[PDB]
Design a protein around this nucleic acid. Structure first.
Ligand SMILES: [Mg+2]
Ligand SMILES: [Mg+2]
Ligand SMILES: [Mg+2]
Ligand SMILES: [Mg+2]
Ligand SMILES: [Mg+2]
Ligand SMILES: [Mg+2]
Ligand SMILES: [Mg+2]
Ligand SMILES: [Mg+2]
Ligand SMILES: [Mg+2]
Ligand SMILES: [Mg+2]
Ligand SMILES: [Mg+2]
Ligand SMILES: [Mg+2]
Ligand SMILES: [Mg+2]
Ligand SMILES: [Mg+2]
Ligand SMILES: [Mg+2]
Ligand SMILES: [Mg+2]
Ligand SMILES: [Mg+2]
Ligand SMILES: [Mg+2]
Ligand SMILES: [Mg+2]
Ligand SMILES: [Mg+2]
Ligand SMILES: [Mg+2]
Ligand SMILES: [Mg+2]
Ligand SMILES: [Mg+2]
Ligand SMILES: [Mg+2]
Ligand SMILES: [Mg+2]
Ligand SMILES: [Mg+2]
Ligand SMILES: [Mg+2]
Ligand SMILES: [Mg+2]
Ligand SMILES: [Mg+2]
Ligand SMILES: [Mg+2]
Ligand SMILES: [Mg+2]
Ligand SMILES: [Mg+2]
Ligand SMILES: [Mg+2]
Ligand SMILES: [Mg+2]
Ligand SMILES: [Mg+2]
Ligand SMILES: [Mg+2]
Ligand SMILES: [Mg+2]
Ligand SMILES: [Mg+2]
Ligand SMILES: [Mg+2]
Ligand SMILES: [Mg+2]
Ligand SMILES: [Mg+2]
Ligand SMILES: [Mg+2]
Ligand SMILES: [Mg+2]
Ligand SMILES: [Mg+2]
Ligand SMILES: [Mg+2]
Ligand SMILES: [Mg+2]
Ligand SMILES: [Mg+2]
Ligand SMILES: [Mg+2]
Ligand SMILES: [Mg+2]
Ligand SMILES: [Mg+2]
Ligand SMILES: [Mg+2]
Ligand SMILES: [Mg+2]
Ligand SMILES: [Mg+2]
Ligand SMILES: [Mg+2]
Ligand SMILES: [Mg+2]
Ligand SMILES: [Mg+2]
Ligand SMILES: [Mg+2]
Ligand SMILES: [Mg+2]
Ligand SMILES: [Mg+2]
Ligand SMILES: [Mg+2]
Ligand SMILES: [Mg+2]
Ligand SMILES: [Mg+2]
Ligand SMILES: [Mg+2]
Ligand SMILES: [Mg+2]
Ligand SMILES: [Mg+2]
Ligand SMILES: [Mg+2]
Ligand SMILES: [Mg+2]
Ligand SMILES: [Mg+2]
Ligand SMILES: [Mg+2]
Ligand SMILES: [Mg+2]
Ligand SMILES: [Mg+2]
Ligand SMILES: [Mg+2]
Ligand SMILES: [Mg+2]
Ligand SMILES: [Mg+2]
Ligand SMILES: [Mg+2]
Ligand SMILES: [Mg+2]
Ligand SMILES: [Mg+2]
Ligand SMILES: [Mg+2]
Ligand SMILES: [Mg+2]
Lengths: 206, 126, 148, 193
RNA sequence: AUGCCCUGACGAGUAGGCAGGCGUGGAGGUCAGUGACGAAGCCUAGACCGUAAGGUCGGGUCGAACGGCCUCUAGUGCAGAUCUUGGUGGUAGUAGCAAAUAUUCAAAUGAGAACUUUGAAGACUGAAGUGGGGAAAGGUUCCACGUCAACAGCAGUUGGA
RNA sequence: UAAUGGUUAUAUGCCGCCCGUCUUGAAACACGGACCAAGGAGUCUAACGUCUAUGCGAGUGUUUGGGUGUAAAACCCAUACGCGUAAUGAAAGUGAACGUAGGUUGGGGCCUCGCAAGAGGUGCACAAUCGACCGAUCCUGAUGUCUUCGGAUGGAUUUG
RNA sequence: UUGACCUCAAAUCAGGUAGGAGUACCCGCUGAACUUAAGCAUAUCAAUAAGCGGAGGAAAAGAAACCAACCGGGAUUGCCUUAGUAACGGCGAGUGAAGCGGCAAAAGCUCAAAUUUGAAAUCUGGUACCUUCGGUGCCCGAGUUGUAAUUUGGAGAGGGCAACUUUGGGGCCGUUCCUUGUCUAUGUUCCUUGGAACAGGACGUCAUAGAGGGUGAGAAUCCCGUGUGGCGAGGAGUGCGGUUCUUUGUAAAGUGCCUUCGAAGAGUCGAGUUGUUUGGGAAUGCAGCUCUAAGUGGGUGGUAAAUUCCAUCUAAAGCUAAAUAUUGGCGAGAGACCGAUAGCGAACAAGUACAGUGAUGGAAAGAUGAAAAGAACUUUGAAAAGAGAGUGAAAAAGUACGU
């Protein structure tokens, strides 16, 4: 009767999921969390809905390598190591890395075709696990979206025009209008209001 | 990965089921692959190994050595092939235990039940 | 999280934060509420005055669903009209089509006058009202209707 | 002991409570097995819809009487007014409760219509004939939902007749308070001479 | 930019409070980390870093796994509790192996005889016995052959071993 | 380069009582400790208090259940229910704007005049003070009534 | 004399059945104390442990002598809530429900009896024969001190009159499930290190299979499995396609009017008292004792009584699946658990060895090596053994064996 399962507010759960999906955009956090995505053309990596109906694992890894997830795929299955303690004889024998998450709208074979591939995880847009999107509480999983998946993400989370399809939910507000303060500090309307600065390391008088 | 709910990925369970397997269940555990000729000739890839089968060792220190199996010594989880023995220092000749997965069967000792087993696995039998 | 506690900081020091002279024991004050009238009275008075003794009548077999009378004030009263239709009732403030607010269907038992509804006539179907709450609704041109 | 400015707690843990701790680890396990049971039952009771049609009744107890809900069974008068017998009603999935009676004509008519709407929407197969299969629907509740009846229209004219409606509450409280005392003084006016 | 820098003052401490860190077992992530060309452990009046907790390296031993960092978690740090379990010392080759009169010579066997076997001699229990049987209890101790690692608090070829 | 320096052993000068513990006071002729390895003592839970972080905010809480699932995860959901939006009284009950939601004293920030000082205006939070409003208490007892019900009005460092 | 009847016996008569185990959960009975109250006698622990009786896969409860006071709900059980509340309590420490509401699951019924009276229409047994969890015939018996049909309060029964609608049963294979068999991918290609390649490097292949395990070091591709499909075999009171009984048939059952009725549980309800119990407070339930009922009346409506109503059920008889419990058994699958002083006492010939008269108590103890390849032989010694020699990758692994 020690507490095992912990309660989180549903909105704070959804807050973290929205901020995790947002982190699977621009590539700085995706590089930072591993995820060999230098030679990707652009992030988010959206592929066609024809991926959702691939039913053979040979054809599935052909498609993921062709859109640039080859180095992420080979990052897994070269990181298979034995676990470093007593857990290797608690049915936790091997450790490896996380690969590309493939997000779909319809399962027409893509889950089973990507099932055996090491590191590659799959997800519906309706679910979007935070344990998959930020594994290790580290933002920026490499995500391959299908085209139907990427369109549906307006329905599932809402926009400024479409509500949310969750009851009462709105995507969270910002408390700052941009993440760059240096642009605000160097804006002309602030740079006129300020006094001139000093030497940035004072000269030692006396 | 495992999808059924009756098979087990428990290590302790799986090693117990191995190390306490009875003789009839150790027969299928002590299977051996077939040669390039036999897999071409029959169409099956491995067989539970029998006594008077002819084998070629493809691994270990006795690699490349041919012979006929004198004993399938299921208690020790091993085969003992004739002509692959160890000389003791006192002139004696003890056989060397080989695991059949490191062998390759080069000739089948055939009777009706081996012939029926090949056709059961979809083999040519020619 | 066991690592964040001060048990991990008291490793090495003898008394584990409890003192040598005091020398942490089983129960130095008695278990639970022992001696609330005897040796805990300066704590029983001062932070709990009124604990000891009886207060008035006993109610045998009290059912709280007799006493169900949730209060709604006139400071709200208009939130029960939905937000879309609310603006077209505040403007065109008239009798002869006045909004009907089933107070009971929203789950209130009594209407109270905390203050200042607009001058729009409303029809209020309350189980109970107060005196001031009745007057303020009627001064806006409305009516209080009693239902059961 | 009694300590600093803290609320007085009432933790009831001086029995042998650790023998009687029930931790519901099996909440997820019991949910699958309940969902397994409904799937097992629905296959067993093929095309039949997994639950009976329950009546709409008015909830008791003045805190809750503003709502209707599903009841237990359709009230033998209602089954008779629907045009069938209770014994036959129990075989085509109508719940019949012998012990409730009707005093509300509005709840009565809401239930007879509910029974007449049910008979229109069910197909009843022959007892021995060919009976081609007709698409099991798993719930009678979702096909026939309990709808709350409307209490008033959304807008009406103001009819203020000056009765003051709080005096009405004060006066009606006082006729109940003194009801016996002025019939007693009236009969003790009539027992003089 | 809980960064970089300028300036000034201060620094005792039990019980106690708080802060910043070190270390351990397990978990999520990561380093496409180390590894049979040697992981971990262990030894090292060799080296280095840190005020310190500790960290690092070299050498020897060894033989199968194990680290850094961002986090999660706890059955997480010992000199003490006449603590628990196990192991080991000094005392110390010490105290002692002194009741029941007592042993001795020769031969044999043997690697080896104060102690075994035989002969010789001296003695004792002295018939309410250290003699012949039994009851309870034991259970094979009886008898033979072979044997001497342990047991017979010396020894042992002897033995109820 | 072991020349300086480090480590280490020794020597020399000066200093240095045995740790832990309870105690006003321990080296005590107070208690525990012959030695070593391993184990070994503020934990978990129910109900809460202050504080802090986070989400939403007059609301909030998905996880009892239901749907769903790649299956104890994740994801989604109705009606309730709990707590909060209203108190007070023993209870029947009653139940929160005279006013720009009050006046006075301070009060940051803002606005205006100012070279600045200051002056003036507005003054959130908060602090002191005098009031007003709701309940209870003790008084006053209007119009009405099938004359005993009703309780308008006006009261107080009384009370919460 | 003789033939019954009643009551009571006997038999190694015919056929059966009960005991004991296990006992985690379940239904009862019986019943503490340590503890807390900073003492303690009420209280609390606790309607608990210990003791005893009785079941099952669940049990118990269960279709109202209910909750309520509403516009009323509607068997039972359980979860969330009610609610740490009403209430009990040296009103101290403490204790402490229920109705409503949301869910999970849903399921309803049977006797007492009507006079069959123009059918004892009912049943056990024996015996015979078949199609044998039974059926048909015959005989004895039970039974009128009442076995069947009909009725069960929601009703219902008798009689009279428009009525229309529904008639049941048994095998077969395939079809549900339980078990279980079998079949169902892809490298052992090259270089280096190594005793061993399963390591590293190169080049591929399969993947609805990269879970897991084995094999001489980390193996998707060597082996078994795994994944997905197929084909069988034996069993389950059967959902469904044919079947066959077919004068199974004016049998039986629903439903409309009038009419007369409507039986409904006794040392029981209830009361007093005693004891115990409860949150139950002028008394919650239970039991002992005493008193002892009624028939448009008996219970209940949480302040005793009297009077007047009202409301709601219908006790003293009975069955009943599911949600629910389950430190036992059987079969599984798991884990941020423990890792040989830990984890069960017990990883091992562990409740063993051993201690005790006995009830009982109760250990220690895992690891050579990839394979015994477990050291031939020589020499010294009486021998144990040594020193060589060998085996082994290693003897700094020699059964006193990993480090
Ligand atoms: Mg370790
Ligand atoms: Mg200190
Ligand atoms: Mg102390
Ligand atoms: Mg006193
Ligand atoms: Mg009520
Ligand atoms: Mg009623
Ligand atoms: Mg009604
Ligand atoms: Mg200091
Ligand atoms: Mg520090
Ligand atoms: Mg760690
Ligand atoms: Mg490596
Ligand atoms: Mg090493
Ligand atoms: Mg040293
Ligand atoms: Mg090894
Ligand atoms: Mg510890
Ligand atoms: Mg210490
Ligand atoms: Mg120690
Ligand atoms: Mg200490
Ligand atoms: Mg000891
Ligand atoms: Mg000693
Ligand atoms: Mg001596
Ligand atoms: Mg002497
Ligand atoms: Mg003498
Ligand atoms: Mg003599
Ligand atoms: Mg002898
Ligand atoms: Mg001796
Ligand atoms: Mg000796
Ligand atoms: Mg003898
Ligand atoms: Mg030099
Ligand atoms: Mg030098
Ligand atoms: Mg020097
Ligand atoms: Mg000195
Ligand atoms: Mg002191
Ligand atoms: Mg001291
Ligand atoms: Mg010491
Ligand atoms: Mg001592
Ligand atoms: Mg000691
Ligand atoms: Mg330790
Ligand atoms: Mg006042
Ligand atoms: Mg007042
Ligand atoms: Mg007999
Ligand atoms: Mg029980
Ligand atoms: Mg019971
Ligand atoms: Mg207590
Ligand atoms: Mg006490
Ligand atoms: Mg006391
Ligand atoms: Mg005492
Ligand atoms: Mg009790
Ligand atoms: Mg018991
Ligand atoms: Mg049984
Ligand atoms: Mg069950
Ligand atoms: Mg039962
Ligand atoms: Mg009944
Ligand atoms: Mg009920
Ligand atoms: Mg509450
Ligand atoms: Mg109690
Ligand atoms: Mg109770
Ligand atoms: Mg259900
Ligand atoms: Mg009938
Ligand atoms: Mg390889
Ligand atoms: Mg291996
Ligand atoms: Mg596979
Ligand atoms: Mg494996
Ligand atoms: Mg297939
Ligand atoms: Mg009755
Ligand atoms: Mg009792
Ligand atoms: Mg009691
Ligand atoms: Mg029963
Ligand atoms: Mg069990
Ligand atoms: Mg160990
Ligand atoms: Mg143990
Ligand atoms: Mg004994
Ligand atoms: Mg060992
Ligand atoms: Mg080997
Ligand atoms: Mg030797
Ligand atoms: Mg070695
Ligand atoms: Mg050697
Ligand atoms: Mg060694
Ligand atoms: Mg070694």
């Amino acid at each position: 009767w020690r507490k095992w399962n912990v309660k989180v507010n549903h909105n704070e759960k959804r807050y973290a999921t929205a901020s995790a999906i947002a982190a699977t955009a621009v590539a700085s956090l995706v590089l930072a969390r591993g995820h060999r995505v230098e030679k990707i053309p652009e992030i988010p990596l959206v592929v066609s809905t024809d991926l959702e109906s691939i039913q053979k694992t040979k054809e599935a890894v052909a498609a993921l390598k062709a859109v640039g997830a080859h180095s992420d795929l080979l990052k897994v299955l070269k990181s298979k190591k034995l676990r470093a303690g007593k857990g290797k004889y608690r049915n936790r024998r091997w450790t490896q890395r996380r690969g590309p998450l493939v997000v779909y709208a319809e399962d027409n074979g893509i889950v089973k075709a990507l099932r055996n591939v090491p590191g590659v995880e799959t997800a519906n847009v309706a679910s979007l696990n935070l344990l998959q999107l930020a594994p290790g509480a580290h933002l920026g999983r490499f995500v391959i979206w299908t085209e139907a998946a990427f369109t549906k993400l307006d329905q599932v989370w809402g926009s400024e025009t479409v509500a949310s399809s969750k009851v009462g939910y709105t995507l969270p507000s910002h408390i700052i209008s941009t993440s760059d303060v240096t642009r605000i500090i160097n804006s002309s309307e602030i740079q006129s209001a300020i006094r001139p600065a000093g030497q940035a390391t004072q000269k030692r008088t006396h | 990965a495992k999808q059924s709910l009756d098979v087990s990925s428990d290590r302790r369970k799986a090693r117990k089921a191995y190390f306490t397997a009875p003789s009839s269940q150790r027969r299928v555990l002590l299977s051996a692959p077939l040669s390039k000729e036999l897999r071409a000739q029959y169409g099956i890839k491995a067989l539970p190994i029998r006594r008077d089968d002819e084998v070629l060792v493809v691994r270990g220190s006795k690699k490349g050595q041919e012979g006929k199996i004198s004993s399938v010594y299921r208690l020790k989880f091993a085969v003992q092939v004739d002509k692959v023995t160890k000389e003791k220092v006192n002139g004696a000749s003890v056989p060397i235990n080989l695991h059949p997965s490191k062998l390759v069967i080069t000739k089948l000792h055939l009777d009706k039940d081996r012939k029926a087993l090949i056709q059961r696995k979809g083999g040519k039998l020619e | 999280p066991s690592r964040f506690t001060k048990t991990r900081k008291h490793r090495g020091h003898v008394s584990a934060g409890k003192g040598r002279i005091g020398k942490h024991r089983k129960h130095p004050g008695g278990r639970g509420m022992a001696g609330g009238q005897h040796h805990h009275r300066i704590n029983m008075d001062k932070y709990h005055p009124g604990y000891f003794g009886k207060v008035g009548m006993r109610y045998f077999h009290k059912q709280q669903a007799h006493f169900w009378k949730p209060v709604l004030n006139l400071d709200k009263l208009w939130t029960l009209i939905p937000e879309d239709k609310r603006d077209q009732y505040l403007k065109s403030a008239s009798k002869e089509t006045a909004p009907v607010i089933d107070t009971l269907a929203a789950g209130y038992g009594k209407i109270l006058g905390k203050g200042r509804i607009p001058n729009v006539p409303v029809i209020v179907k309350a189980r109970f009202v107060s005196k001031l709450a009745e007057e303020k609704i009627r001064a806006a041109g409305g009516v209080v209707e009693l239902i059961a | 002991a009694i300590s600093k400015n803290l609320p007085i707690l009432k933790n009831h843990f001086r029995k042998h409570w650790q023998e009687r701790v029930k931790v519901h680890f099996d909440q997820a396990g019991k949910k699958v097995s309940r969902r397994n049971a409904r799937a097992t039952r629905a296959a067993k009771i093929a095309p039949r819809p997994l639950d009976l049609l329950r009546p709409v009744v008015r909830a008791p107890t003045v805190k809750y009487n503003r709502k209707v809900r599903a009841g237990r069974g359709f009230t033998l008068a209602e089954v008779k007014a629907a045009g069938l017998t209770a014994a036959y009603a129990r075989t085509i999935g109508i719940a019949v409760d012998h012990r409730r009676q009707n005093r509300n004509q509005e709840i009565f008519d809401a239930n007879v219509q509910r029974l007449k709407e049910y008979q229109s929407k069910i197909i009843v197969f022959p007892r021995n004939g060919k009976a081609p299969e007709a698409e099991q629907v798993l719930s009678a509740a979702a096909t026939f939902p309990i709808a709350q009846p409307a209490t008033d229209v959304e807008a009406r004219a103001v009819q203020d007749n000056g009765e003051s409606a709080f005096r009405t509450l004060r006066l009606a409280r006082s006729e109940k308070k003194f009801r016996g005392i002025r019939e007693k003084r009236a009969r003790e006016k009539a027992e003089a001479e």
